[PDB]
Amino acid sequence: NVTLTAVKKAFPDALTNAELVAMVSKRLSQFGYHKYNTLLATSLCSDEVTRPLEQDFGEVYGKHFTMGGLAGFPFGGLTGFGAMAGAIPDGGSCLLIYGSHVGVSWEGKWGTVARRGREKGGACCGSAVAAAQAVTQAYQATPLDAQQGYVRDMLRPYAATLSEAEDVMVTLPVSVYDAQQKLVTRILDEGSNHIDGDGQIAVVGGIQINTPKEMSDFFVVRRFCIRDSSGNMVENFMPL
Amino acid sequence: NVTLTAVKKAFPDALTNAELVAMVSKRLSQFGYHKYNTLLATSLCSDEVTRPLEQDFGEVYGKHFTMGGLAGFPFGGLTGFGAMAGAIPDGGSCLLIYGSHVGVSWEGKWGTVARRGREKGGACCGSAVAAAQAVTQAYQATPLDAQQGYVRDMLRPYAATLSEAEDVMVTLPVSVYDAQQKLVTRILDEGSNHIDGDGQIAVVGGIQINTPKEMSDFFVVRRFCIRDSSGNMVENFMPL
Ligand SMILES: [Zn+2]
Ligand SMILES: [Zn+2]
């Protein structure tokens, strides 16, 4: 209950995984998205704690393409998006789920969550937290590891915001989501041509909240829309 | 059948996914790898067709960390490896599954495989095939997309091999695996520190063979070994 209260204090609109998948699949079914004709894609952190969300959508839409990497950025990039587009069922569409993530503990502390078989869970999101430390310290001072370098690069503009935050562990996944949303939008704008005529791309973006094992995880929806083959938005389902 | 003949012709030692998981789990159980104390990690291509292998090992060892990206290279890098190591159950170990992959069609043609809801399946591995084309064409003339650039980079040493190949589609996954094995070894040598004392890293590396839907997928084991927290190889299970 302390955890759940903390979740809803920071994010009053947060949905359980079950609520999210039910809502998204119900809405998209009105627009012709079904199992046979939808290709699922995710851009979520490589951390094992993010797997339940992929599994919950995969029960609906089947095996998914991954475009993510550390902290959930779409490191698959243009080539990854094109690979995905090239696998969409004929006359069908893609559903992309992306976001940052953050752990919240049994005592409602953000930025950490208990991990299986460990007494100390450590940071969640680990990549984002390490990156935030590096960019804020450098700010306050007024391919072997290329991904983590990119995470620092994309987090650098938020250094002031992070340093001034009341709770940096809540502000961090919001900033990471903002950086992701920009990059995803750029990729979709560039790889627009790869979607065939009638085909669409539905997008769900937000913040994944990883809770202790006895609890459902949660998701904060910040983007839920459909774009056409020409890169144009044709439906916006926000706000919920 | 035609597909199975092609598979065994080029890869006599290929195992079905079921055979692979049975063999690996049986062997590692003799070395104390069980569900409660093992953290599963993969470095496989972002392509949706590679998911069954993750699911099959996931049934035994649970939710996995991902390290992969385009063509299955360990793009998570040092930070990704450290993130994984920091989540290993106390006193437990990691199991890393990595590999290239390749499609084989109902007609026994390499480098392609039928995809759900599609008349044309396109390349498999798409990323590797595109990279191969680029580096062999360049040879024969004697963040937005950084991963594919890295794939081209790591395949460049193999340009002569690929251009001389009798069937480049059957040679390509072997070259990709060779490039992967070097990078994985480098990451494990660097991030050895992150494993604590008694903890080990078990490694399975090879070539994932993606077959038509009515058929089992296969895997060609090229590496199956155990390393200790100091980076030393303590067991080598090859050849099977
Ligand atoms: Zn993370
Ligand atoms: Zn691939």
Descriptive overview:
The structure is a homodimer of 240-residue chains. With 240 residues, chain A is an alpha/beta fold. The first copy, chain A, has one domain. The first copy, chain A, is 40% helix and 19% strand. Chain A contains eight helices and seven strands. Chain A has helices at residues 2-10, 17-29, 51-61, 77-85, 126-140, 146-155, 159-163, 168-190; strands spanning 15-16, 38-43, 64-66, 93-103, 201-210, 218-227, 233-236. In chain A, strands 1, 2, 3, 4, 5, 6 and 7 form a seven-stranded mixed beta sheet that branches. In chain A, β5 and β6 form a beta hairpin. In chain A, α2 (17-29) runs parallel beside α3 (51-61) and α5 (126-140) crosses α6 (146-155). The longest helix of chain A has 23 residues, at 168-190. The structure holds zinc ion (2 copies). One zinc ion is lined by residues 45, 47, 71, 101, 125-127 of chain B.
| Spatial separation of the terminal alpha carbons of chain A | 24 Å
Q: What proportion strand of chain A?
A: 15-25%
Query: So how many helices of chain A?
Result: 8
Number of domains of chain A: 1
Chain oligomer state: homodimer
Structure class of chain A: alpha/beta
User: What is the H/E string of chain A?
Assistant: HEHEHEHEHHHHEEE
Q: Which geometry of chain A do the CA atoms define?
A: globular
- Which two protein chains have the largest interface (Cβ within 8 Å of the partner's Cβ), and how many residues from each? A-B, 55 and 55 residues
Reported for the largest beta sheet of chain A, the result is: 7 strands, mixed
- The residue fraction in helices of chain A comes out at 25-40%
Evaluate the radius of gyration of chain A. 18 Å
Tell how many strands the DSSP assignment of chain A holds: 7
PDB class: metal binding protein
Keywords: metalloenzyme, metal binding protein
Assembly: dimeric
Entry title: Crystal structure of PtLCIB4 H88A mutant, a homolog of the limiting CO2-inducible protein LCIB
